Amino acid sequence: NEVRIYPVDYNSAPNEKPIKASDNSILIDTGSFLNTAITFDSFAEVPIL
Amino acid sequence: NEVRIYPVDYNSAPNEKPIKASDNSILIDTGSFLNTAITFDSFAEVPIL
Amino acid sequence: NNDDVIKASNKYYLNNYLEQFGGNLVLFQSSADLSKKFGTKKEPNLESSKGITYDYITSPVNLYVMNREDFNNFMDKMSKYPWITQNFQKIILIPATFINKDDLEAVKTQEDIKGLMTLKNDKLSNEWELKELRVPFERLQYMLNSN
Amino acid sequence: KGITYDYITSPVNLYVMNREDFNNFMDKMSKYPWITQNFQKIILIPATF
Numbered sequence: 086n087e088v089r090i091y092p093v094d095y096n097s098a099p100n101e102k103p104i105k106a107s108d109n110s111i112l113i114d115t116g117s118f119l120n121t122a123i124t125f126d127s128f129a130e131v132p133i134l
Numbered sequence: 135n136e137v138r139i140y141p142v143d144y145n146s147a148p149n150e151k152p153i154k155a156s157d158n159s160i161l162i163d164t165g166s167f168l169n170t171a172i173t174f175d176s177f178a179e180v181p182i183l
Numbered sequence: 184n185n186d187d188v189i190k191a192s193n194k195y196y197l198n199n200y201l202e203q204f205g206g207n208l209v210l211f212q213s214s215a216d217l218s219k220k221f222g223t224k225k226e227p228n229l230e231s232s233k234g235i236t237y238d239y240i241t242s243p244v245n246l247y248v249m250n251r252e253d254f255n256n257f258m259d260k261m262s263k264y265p266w267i268t269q270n271f272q273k274i275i276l277i278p279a280t281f282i283n284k285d286d287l288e289a290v291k292t293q294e295d296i297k298g299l300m301t302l303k304n305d306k307l308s309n310e311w312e313l314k315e316l317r318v319p320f321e322r323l324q325y326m327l328n329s330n
Numbered sequence: 331k332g333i334t335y336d337y338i339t340s341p342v343n344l345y346v347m348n349r350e351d352f353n354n355f356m357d358k359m360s361k362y363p364w365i366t367q368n369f370q371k372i373i374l375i376p377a378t379f
Contacts, residue, residue: 098195111200135375159310178374180242181272183214183366216360230360231367234353241349242372243356253335 091122140171187298197326202315206279209254211247215270220293227266244272246302248287253298260294281308342370 104113126127146164154161215229222228232245249257261268286306290299324330332339347355359366 094201098197101197104199104201113201116196135373180240180372181212181244182372183243183368190344229363232361232364233356236349236353240374241352
């Protein structure tokens with residue numbers, strides 16, 4: 086489990102084209118796109134037997 | 135297992151005498167003599183049962 | 184490469200290219216050899232493995248490869264045998280492009296397994312060429328707006 | 331037993347075999363799981379040494 090939260094339209098020059106698949110989902114968002122983003126890890130953990 | 139490869143006659147002033155045993159093998163070569171040398175380690179490893 | 188340069192205040196990404204390998208065959212490292220018959224439920228039977236010698240590198244462990252769909256079915260079939268499952272060492276999702284289809288060999292066990300396969304004694308994986316990540320100099324100039 | 335190779339001695343035993351014969355030897359010893367479990371380390375030393 087992991088989350089990576091990055092700004093959108095950050096350090097992205099206008100007219101940039103974000104690559105996408107046939108589903109139209111934005112595989113690579115414009116800008117830093119996780120190059121400068123927060124990495125949420127370790128949602129939790131509990132002692133195990 | 136390990137290899138150490140060092141230059142010979144490197145930073146060694148002329149007239150230097152390399153110490154050797156009766157076998158005449160050069161125990162201590164002239165110059166840096168492993169002070170500045172490449173250290174080849176981990177020839178390989180394969181998963182074990 | 185000279186040092187005569189003036190700093191550019193504003194810079195932003197212009198073009199993005201992505202190169203990926205969709206196929207992901209499931210690798211399988213197992214010390215126990217599945218070719219040999221497993222022991223019955225009460226009494227087990229293990230015989231270790233043999234040396235594959237893939238990519239000029241040899242080790243006792245055995246490597247199997249199977250598609251994503253068949254892996255869970257194979258796990259379900261082998262649920263009866265806990266000791267063999269405990270013996271599995273490492274599981275890796277290698278891309279499909281690297282491994283030649285021909286190099287794969289089918290293997291038959293005591294039970295009926297759908298699509299278990301094993302690598303040959305001596306074979307070499309392909310080189311993953313990159314084609315999308317190729318930009319000529321003129322394209323760089325055009326992106327610089329200086330043609 | 332103690333081999334005492336290169337002036338250094340330890341209880342472990344060292345064997346050497348060519349790449350082709352190793353897999354056949356593994357197949358022959360598959361009947362004996364406890365011996366195989368006892369193998370400690372496998373290294374691909376160059377032949378020249």
